Design an enzyme around this catalytic site. Structure first.
Site, PDB file in Angstrom:
ATOM      1  CG  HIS A  85      39.952  38.726  37.742  1.00 14.17           C
ATOM      2  ND1 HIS A  85      38.528  38.338  38.151  1.00 14.17           N
ATOM      3  CD2 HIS A  85      39.794  39.914  37.301  1.00 14.17           C
ATOM      4  CE1 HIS A  85      37.925  39.493  38.064  1.00 14.17           C
ATOM      5  NE2 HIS A  85      38.572  40.367  37.582  1.00 14.17           N
ATOM      6  CG  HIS A 150      36.239  39.613  33.680  1.00 12.06           C
ATOM      7  ND1 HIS A 150      35.379  41.010  33.661  1.00 12.06           N
ATOM      8  CD2 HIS A 150      37.033  40.063  34.787  1.00 12.06           C
ATOM      9  CE1 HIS A 150      35.872  41.819  34.324  1.00 12.06           C
ATOM     10  NE2 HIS A 150      36.714  41.336  34.914  1.00 12.06           N
TER      11      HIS A 150
END
Ligand code: XMU
Ligand code: ZN
Ligand code: ZN
Length: 232
Positions: A85, A150
């Site tokens: 990410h 997340h």
């Protein structure tokens, strides 16, 4: 001395490796953020006589130290890296990697978010991952997009030869009491994204969180539980 290394055992700037399975290691480093110190994990997967890296070691100097540690302990070249990410614990150090000959990759989503945030930007886009449940092969791993958790872009990585599931920051360690840093999270979708992971990787033997201690499949349910309770 063989146990999984914890935050107080790693000075910031130093990197440790931990053998997970044949041809699979985690890397552990520590970094300061907003005045507190945190550990962070990544992955290393043997790819013939080369290595695939998953995630930086959270910073330029940590990532240089990671490369040195890999050379000391493994002695094969890192040729490719995937960032799971857009946060600095995943992409901070990409510029170091690129200058060390490593081809850096991330989804287009991750690349956009990193650019917008002012974080380091992997060079190459990973297509085929834009819808939840998507999977692609990348060397000795499978990359899987479980949906927003997340972060909206978070990817998970599976090593089929070893049944190792690397959850990244979508997965918490068993001692977790809170959803962690949730500013970019989707607390409502996170359980659904974890359930996708559970359904897709029912044979996982080792589950590695983005931060903290590996365990088994229970990390997935624990994560769902903590996130639901935090939202609530
Ligand atoms: C690099 C990453 N930036 C972000 O997230 C971020 C940053 C900015 C913005 C908005 N512009 C939005 C998000 C990050 C930094 C610090 C700690 C973390 C953590 C983390 C992991 C675990 C814990 C729990 N410990 C707390 C103290 O002692 C015991 C356990 N707390 C925080 C994560 C993560 O949860 O993945 N990421 C971090
Ligand atoms: Zn993050
Ligand atoms: Zn994280």
């Amino acid at each position: 001395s063989g146990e999984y290394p914890t935050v107080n055992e790693i000075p910031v700037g130093e990197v440790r490796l931990y053998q997970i399975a044949d041809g699979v290691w985690s890397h552990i480093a520590t970094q300061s953020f907003d005045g507190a110190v945190y550990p962070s994990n990544g992955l290393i997967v043997r790819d013939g006589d080369e290595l695939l890296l998953i995630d930086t070691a959270w910073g330029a100097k940590n990532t240089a130290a990671l490369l040195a540690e890999i050379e000391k302990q493994i002695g094969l070249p890192v040729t490719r890296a995937v960032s799971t990410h857009f946060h600095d614990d995943r992409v901070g150090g990409v510029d170091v990697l690129r200058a060390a000959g490593v081809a850096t990759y991330a989804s287009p989503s991750t690349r956009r978010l990193a650019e917008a945030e002012g974080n380091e930007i992997p060079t190459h886009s990973l297509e085929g991952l834009s819808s939840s449940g998507d999977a692609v092969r990348f060397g000795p791993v499978e990359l899987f997009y479980p949906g927003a958790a997340h972060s909206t872009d978070n990817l998970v990585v599976y090593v089929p030869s070893a049944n190792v599931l690397y959850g990244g920051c979508a997965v918490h360690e068993l001692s977790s009491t809170s959803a962690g840093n949730v500013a970019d999270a989707d607390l409502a979708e996170w359980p659904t994204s974890v359930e996708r992971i559970q359904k897709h990787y029912p044979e996982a033997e080792v589950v590695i969180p983005g931060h903290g201690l590996p365990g088994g499949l229970d990390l997935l349910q624990h994560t769902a539980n903590v996130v639901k309770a935090h939202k609530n």
